[PDB]
């Protein structure tokens, strides 16, 4: 058992290089790898070699530049790149520090060099941390750049996020899925399917992407990768981007649950989905309040919530047929 | 559960094909805190029953059925027993929650 | 100076703060929540209730109303001549003077002089960064808590349904395919014995909140940027908007609706200095309440001036029996 | 001027504001729910009772019938001569002249100029946005509180059945087959001394509300986009549109029912200045309230005078004693 | 001197430390998960919990409005006449008071001495260091767990939508391309029964952090650096400073919604040495643990006044009857 | 106690078609009974119908209406005279009135 132990820094940029150690195994093979959550180490288990590691590694590198050529000092409209990199310079320091892992390790030679952490990849991160009396100067934390590239490679393959522009604003909310207890690989790569590219919406009528609770329903209504959050324990971990008047900040850190959402989605598309999937999105462009109240409901099993957001939704344009309400009424036990 | 038929009359006051908008018994049997208010929020939307008749007979599709009455003992044999507000909600809240599905009436 | 006033309004037959649009049927009326004690554990208790915006609008119109027939209502903000909340929103920087004349949002003394709604409103300058915090608090309107206990539940919300004739010239009531808007909807009214509670800060009107003082000769000198007959023109017209606060304009639909006001009872404190908050109507045991608290506050060395309507208070303490709203104000205004 | 007018008036076996029924045969009453204060404890009741909309809509016909006969009455609206309520629905952007011709939507003043309905009822263009919000004030005609506490309720409904006999050329009633209408349905009437209360905002008749005054040398004044003659007609028929609403003219069902509609008493207050209104008859204790709220508004300098009917105002007040409402009106239409 | 109120409060119709919205049309007011438990099970309610920041705020708000009308007042910096209270920063090495006096920053007494809201809410030179810590602090403002227990369910948090029309010269409305400002958000109001508790150490005021004795006559005496008279002037006006504070003037929309504020019941101890905290009313059997460890700290030799409002806490225990806020501040004052 | 539904089946003759007898009035006094006396006067008008009915069944090809047995009378008046709180009244009242908007097949 190779066993890979993985840094630890900080329980979500850990968690991203840890959860991109998979598919970095995965492209270079090894077969029967787990993954034991220390809390935050987030070790690995497999029976993989360093070289065969190395591979996958590269393999997932060149991948990933080969989509970053795809557009264009090269700025591309990808996922690591500029779709969830709020600031400027990181697009084009992250292909750049990206081709240099590439260039190092594609000659047998362990890179030797450390970079800075966006806060991208951790948003515990930033550019000022008290040491005793103050802050520091440039940004403190710093990374080496073999666990930095795992972690990209883990955040653009696994991780989906939305970003939404409405003019010269920009809000992009991204969202992680942690297991608590224990993963085999096939879970893992499940949660993988999650992760869709390029979502940058913008328009106009599909300005319900605020309110990051909303927009992460919305896209999981659209995905059907796979029921395991019912029989396995998932949290999920999300933050926003918002680069208003290129005041690049976060404002929303709340952490959520996904088992009860996708149950509830499960138990509501299981009669129809013809009248399921329409009328989430008819809710949802319409009746904002109704949506908003739904989710909460979901989220706190209350009887209200779900008869507000109906009549909001009859208000203006939603059908709400027999069989959605039929399964909502079997929910309710 | 007798809960259909009763949720395809209630449906019979949101519709559009009955431009009448009877959204206020829709609130009182939703907002139902104890036995009494749920009750009559269920008689104010029954007694606009000859409401809907003449309003589908003089538009043209078939006139509405009213819920029929060997269930209607059935709803007070069981709510009488809902002390709680607790597990009466699980009812009182169902009943409006049956009144907005699709329940198609007139062709 | 600083006043506080709290007491209980019969109000009935009200769509005051509705929800539902003008085109959306079956308009709704705003619920609040509130926690009562039923003899039992706080329970909550859905209840049709009044924001303070509203009220924070109608004190507004009302001290524009008036402090135009004031000579110094040239001093005002065009928006403000119109009944417009709109104080300096987000994309300006030169605002327009009722006469026409621009004024610059750079310097709060100079935002307050040249205007006077927003220096007893106060004001956002977004775009400045400029600020003043409202002189004038109002709170919500609930129903009082032993009102809600004794009715247990009864909706207090009549839904009247009324529609228009809207009809072709030709005398043909026509479908949405013809031209005309005869459509259904209905309105929410509310009833019951509110209580209502507002504050207001006139003791530092005409003051910027950046320099408070002046320190001139080594004395607490308040920077009264205006002259003190416009400051008191401008208590007296803030005092005087109270008048048609308690008579049927603290609400919207009053075309067609209207609502039926009655003060019960109410008390009113004021000392020309810092003064605790009255408690507000919704609590049953609130006059008792109040009696200590102005009690202690008279005791504690504040020179506290009461006025009481029908209600004996404590009957022991200096407080005057004012028969109206309009004997209060004048009183207020008395002591200015 | 404005005008401020409370009191109670008794209707017996009135059907005014109903529902129409519309797909029943039982023509329901309006019903409102009214806080009553009760020896033991605030209780809330449901009584039938007209809505503001209505007597603002039989306001405006009466403003309309006496402003036909005036010269200057062309100025009005097809819809209006049609006494029809809905002013400048959605989609339109044009108004239909009384003589024919067609008034742009773009401008407020041109409106008020060449539509004195508009002037007065106010008006609402959502294609343009032209809002202008009504001078006349209309609440509802709720049943005063003592009569409740003096009849217990007794239901105050009655139920009377009519038929409708529908004789064809042989003379059958038919069996709903060959094309007969014979059917039975049913009428609600109610009765009560119900209160009432009105407000007549006449003092922004051909002044726009986007610019009331000019400024030219920094002396307020009225900005009236019409000839003062148009003016004084259009308040004389303000101010005449009260007698074909003391007399019997209020609610629907004037064929059938008719309803007595006998004034039982009244307060009102007119002053050129601004004045709060009065206490609405509803409540039992509202005449001592007048006289407290009318002696301190002249304790401020308000230049009011007050017409009672059937009220004595005590001796301090100085109130003129009219016996009907033809001399009430005339002594308004006076104070010009 | 060193005071602790610890009780439950009956508040609601409030949007109190809400998120903002700054760049969201939609503003949420706080929501926080909170355990309770629930007959033999552990679960988690989503309810508000008010911040103890905004608390501090304006029981710095009050202190510093208090503090005007006596003739004491001119030991105060420009700074916090505009509810600010920044106090300095890396930059900053002189403080300018509301005069406009210059005061330097080399030692703590002196800047104590021309200062009197950086010697109650504490500040920090990190220049130099010479930290010195807030001496009033303010814990959460959440519903108690007997109210969510009683609940349960129920949504608490009513969503209100308001707009803001701006026509044009005329009538004209505009919605995105007219160059007008017609915005339509929703506020979040909250309701409940909330628990709160607060420790203000009037004692060590006007005292120097780093020498709370002088000690040169063979009596450590306190090291009063600052003039008694105006240092019990202080004092008052620290304690008047709760005055707007169990009124309804904590948070923010006040304009617009103004809580409706009653204080339920509360438990508060006074005494001229230092004494522990009670308990945060957010816990439903708080008044045993008052009970307790008021009993255990009077047996540990602590002369403890302790002063009740609408709680029993045991007749064995010498509590004092309190009407209401300002009974006990009026019973506060006399030391 | 089984004699709601019986008492019901009479109330329903009072507002269904085939009997040309449109009673609404007395449905909405029987059904918003505050107190008992009203609610027993509002049981008293439907009953006044029972000839008015009775008679016209037979005359239409209509089976006879069922009248309501004495001992359903016995046994409101029971109900009534020991309730004497509006409280349950109300729900009491609700109940029987509920009966009288059926799909009763009265005429096969």
Same mark, same amino acid.
């Given at each position: 058992?190779?066993?890979?132990?993985?840094?630890?820094?900080?329980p979500?940029?850990?968690?991203?290089?840890?959860?991109?150690?998979?598919?970095?195994?995965?492209?270079?093979?090894?077969?029967?790898?787990?993954?034991?959550?220390?809390?935050?180490?987030?070790?690995?288990?497999?029976?993989v070699?360093?070289?065969?590691?190395?591979?996958?590694?590269?393999?997932?590198?060149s991948?990933?530049?080969?989509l970053?050529?795809?557009?264009?000092?090269?700025?591309?409209?990808?996922?690591?790149?500029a779709?969830?990199?709020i600031?400027?310079?990181?697009?084009?320091?992250?292909?750049?520090?990206?081709e240099?892992?590439?260039?190092?390790?594609?000659?047998?030679?362990?890179?030797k060099?450390?970079?800075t952490?966006?806060?991208?990849?951790?948003?515990?991160?930033?550019?000022?941390?008290?040491?005793?009396?103050?802050?520091?100067?440039?940004?403190?934390?710093?990374?080496?750049?073999?666990?930095?590239?795992?972690?990209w490679?883990?955040?653009?393959?696994?991780?989906?996020?939305?970003?939404?522009?409405?003019?010269?604003?920009?809000?992009?909310?991204?969202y992680?899925?942690?297991?608590?207890?224990?993963v085999?690989?096939?879970?893992?790569?499940?949660?993988k399917?999650?992760?869709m590219?390029?979502?940058?919406?913008?328009?106009?009528?599909?300005?319900?992407?605020?309110?990051?609770?909303?927009?992460?329903?919305?896209?999981?209504?659209?995905?059907?990768a796979?029921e395991?959050?019912?029989?396995?324990?998932?949290?999920?971990h999300?933050?926003?981007?918002?680069?208003?008047?290129?005041?690049?900040?976060?404002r929303?850190?709340?952490?959520?649950?996904?088992?009860?959402?996708?149950?509830?989605?499960?138990?509501?598309?299981?009669?129809?989905?013809?009248?399921?999937?329409?009328?989430?999105?008819?809710?949802?462009?319409?009746?904002?309040?109704?949506?908003?109240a739904?989710?909460?409901?979901?989220?706190?099993?209350?009887?209200?919530?779900?008869?507000?957001?109906?009549?909001?939704?009859?208000k203006?344009?939603?059908?709400?047929?027999?069989?959605?309400?039929?399964?909502?009424?079997?929910?309710?036990? | 559960?007798?809960i259909?038929?009763?949720?395809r009359y209630?449906?019979?006051?949101?519709?559009?094909?009955?431009?009448?908008?009877?959204?206020?018994?829709?609130?009182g049997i939703?907002?139902?805190?104890?036995?009494?208010?749920?009750?009559?929020?269920?008689?104010?939307?029954?007694?606009?029953?000859?409401?809907?008749?003449k309003?589908?007979?003089?538009?043209?599709?078939?006139?509405?059925?009213?819920?029929?009455p060997?269930?209607?003992?059935?709803?007070?044999?069981?709510?009488?027993?809902?002390?709680?507000?607790?597990?009466?909600?699980?009812?009182?809240?169902?009943?409006?929650?049956?009144?907005?599905?699709?329940?198609?009436?007139?062709? | 100076?600083?006043?506080?006033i709290?007491?209980?309004?019969?109000?009935?037959?009200?769509?005051?703060?509705?929800?539902?649009?003008?085109?959306?049927?079956?308009?709704?009326?705003?619920?609040?929540?509130?926690?009562?004690?039923?003899?039992?554990?706080?329970?909550?208790v859905?209840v049709?209730?009044?924001?303070?915006?509203?009220?924070?609008?109608?004190?507004?119109?009302?001290?524009?109303?008036?402090?135009?027939?004031?000579?110094?209502?040239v001093?005002?903000?065009?928006?403000? /001549?119109?009944?417009?909340?709109?104080r300096?929103?987000q994309?300006?920087?030169?605002?327009?003077?009722?006469?026409?004349?621009?004024?610059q949002?750079?310097?709060?003394?100079?935002?307050?002089?040249?205007?006077?709604?927003?220096?007893?409103?106060?004001?956002?300058?977004?775009?400045?960064?400029?600020?003043?915090?409202?002189?004038?608090?109002?709170?919500?309107? /609930?129903?009082?808590?032993?009102?809600?206990?004794?009715?247990?539940?009864?909706?207090?919300?009549?839904?009247?349904?009324?529609?228009?004739?809207?009809?072709?010239?030709?005398?043909?009531?026509?479908?949405?395919?013809?031209?005309?808007?005869?459509?259904?909807?209905?309105?929410?009214?509310?009833?019951?014995?509110?209580?209502?509670?507002?504050?207001?800060?006139?003791?530092?009107?005409?003051?910027?909140?950046?320099?408070?003082?002046?320190?001139?000769?080594?004395?607490?000198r308040?920077?009264?940027?205006?002259?003190?007959?416009?400051?008191?023109?401008?208590?007296?017209?803030?005092?005087?908007?109270?008048?048609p606060?308690?008579?049927?304009?603290?609400?919207?639909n009053?075309?067609?609706?209207?609502?039926?006001?009655?003060?019960?009872? /109410?008390?009113?404190?004021?000392?020309?200095?810092?003064?605790?908050?009255?408690?507000?109507?919704?609590?049953?045991?609130?006059?008792?309440?109040?009696?200590?608290?102005?009690?202690?506050?008279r005791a504690?060395?504040?020179?506290?001036?009461?006025?009481?309507?029908?209600?004996? /208070?404590?009957?022991?303490?200096?407080?005057?029996?004012?028969?109206?709203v309009?004997?209060?104000?004048?009183?207020?205004?008395?002591?200015?």
């Open positions: 058992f190779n066993e890979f132990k993985t840094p630890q820094i900080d979500i940029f850990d968690l991203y290089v840890a959860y991109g150690y998979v598919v970095s195994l995965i492209r270079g093979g090894a077969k029967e790898a787990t993954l034991i959550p220390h809390g935050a180490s987030y070790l690995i288990q497999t029976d070699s360093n070289e065969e590691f190395r591979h996958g590694l590269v393999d997932a590198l991948s990933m530049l080969s970053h050529i795809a557009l264009a000092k090269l700025v591309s409209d990808a996922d690591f790149s779709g969830a990199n600031n400027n310079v990181y697009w084009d320091s992250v292909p750049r520090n990206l240099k892992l590439m260039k190092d390790l594609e000659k047998k030679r362990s890179v060099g450390t970079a952490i966006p806060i991208t990849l951790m948003p515990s991160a930033g550019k000022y941390m008290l040491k005793h009396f103050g802050v520091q100067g440039g940004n403190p934390i710093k990374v080496d750049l073999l666990n930095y590239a795992l972690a490679v883990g955040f653009h393959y696994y991780t989906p996020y939305i970003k939404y522009a409405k003019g010269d604003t920009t809000w992009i909310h991204i992680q899925i942690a297991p608590v207890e224990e085999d690989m096939i879970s893992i790569l499940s949660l399917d999650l992760k590219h390029l979502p940058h919406y913008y328009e106009s009528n599909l300005d319900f992407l605020i309110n990051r609770r909303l927009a992460l329903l919305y896209h999981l209504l659209h995905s059907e796979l395991l959050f019912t029989e396995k324990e998932f949290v999920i999300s933050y926003t981007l918002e680069r208003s008047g290129n005041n690049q900040a976060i929303s850190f709340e952490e959520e649950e996904i088992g009860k959402l996708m149950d509830f989605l499960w138990k509501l598309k299981r009669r129809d989905f013809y009248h399921a999937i329409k009328f989430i999105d008819d809710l949802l462009k319409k009746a904002t309040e109704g949506a908003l739904l989710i909460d409901a979901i989220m706190n099993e209350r009887l209200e919530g779900f008869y507000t957001a109906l009549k909001l939704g009859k203006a344009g939603v059908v709400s047929s027999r069989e959605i309400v039929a399964a909502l009424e079997d929910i309710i036990c | 559960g007798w259909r038929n009763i949720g209630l449906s019979y006051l949101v519709d559009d094909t009955f431009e009448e908008y009877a959204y206020d018994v829709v609130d939703a907002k139902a805190r104890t036995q009494e208010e749920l009750l009559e929020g269920v008689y104010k939307a029954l007694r606009l029953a000859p409401k809907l008749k309003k589908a007979e003089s538009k043209g599709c078939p006139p509405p059925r009213i819920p029929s060997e269930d209607i003992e059935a709803l007070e044999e069981k709510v009488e027993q809902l002390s709680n507000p607790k597990d009466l909600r699980k009812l009182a809240v169902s009943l409006a929650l049956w009144a907005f599905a699709s329940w198609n009436n007139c062709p | 100076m600083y006043v506080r709290s007491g209980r309004i019969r109000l009935n037959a009200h769509s005051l703060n509705a929800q539902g649009g003008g085109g959306t049927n079956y308009i709704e009326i705003t619920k609040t929540k509130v926690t009562v004690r039923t003899e039992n554990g706080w329970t909550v859905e049709p209730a009044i924001t303070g915006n509203m009220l924070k609008h109608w004190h507004f119109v009302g001290f524009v109303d008036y402090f135009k027939t004031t000579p110094y209502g001093n005002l903000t065009e928006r403000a /001549l119109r009944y417009n909340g709109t300096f929103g994309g300006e920087t030169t605002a327009t003077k009722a006469n026409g004349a621009t004024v949002l750079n310097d709060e003394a100079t935002i307050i002089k040249e205007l006077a709604d927003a220096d007893v409103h106060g004001f956002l300058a977004p775009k400045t960064g400029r600020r003043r915090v409202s002189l004038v608090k109002a709170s919500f309107i /609930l129903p009082t808590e032993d009102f809600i206990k004794e009715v247990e539940g009864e909706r207090l919300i009549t839904a009247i349904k009324h529609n228009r004739v809207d009809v072709d010239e030709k005398g043909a009531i026509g479908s949405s395919k013809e031209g005309t808007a005869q459509m259904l909807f209905s309105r929410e009214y509310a009833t019951g014995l509110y209580g209502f509670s507002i504050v207001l800060d006139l003791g530092l009107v005409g003051i910027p909140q950046g320099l408070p003082v002046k320190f001139e000769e080594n004395q607490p308040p920077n009264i940027v205006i002259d003190p007959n416009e400051r008191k023109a401008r208590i007296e017209s803030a005092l005087k908007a109270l008048i606060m308690l008579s049927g304009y603290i609400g919207a009053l075309a067609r609706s209207f609502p039926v006001f009655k003060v019960e009872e /109410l008390v009113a404190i004021a000392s020309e200095g810092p003064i605790p908050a009255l408690v507000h109507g919704f609590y049953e045991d609130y006059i008792e309440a109040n009696r200590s608290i102005i009690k202690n506050a504690l060395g504040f020179n506290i001036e009461v006025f009481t309507y029908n209600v004996d /208070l404590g009957e022991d303490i200096e407080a005057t029996k004012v028969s109206s309009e004997e209060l104000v004048a009183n207020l205004v008395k002591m200015v």
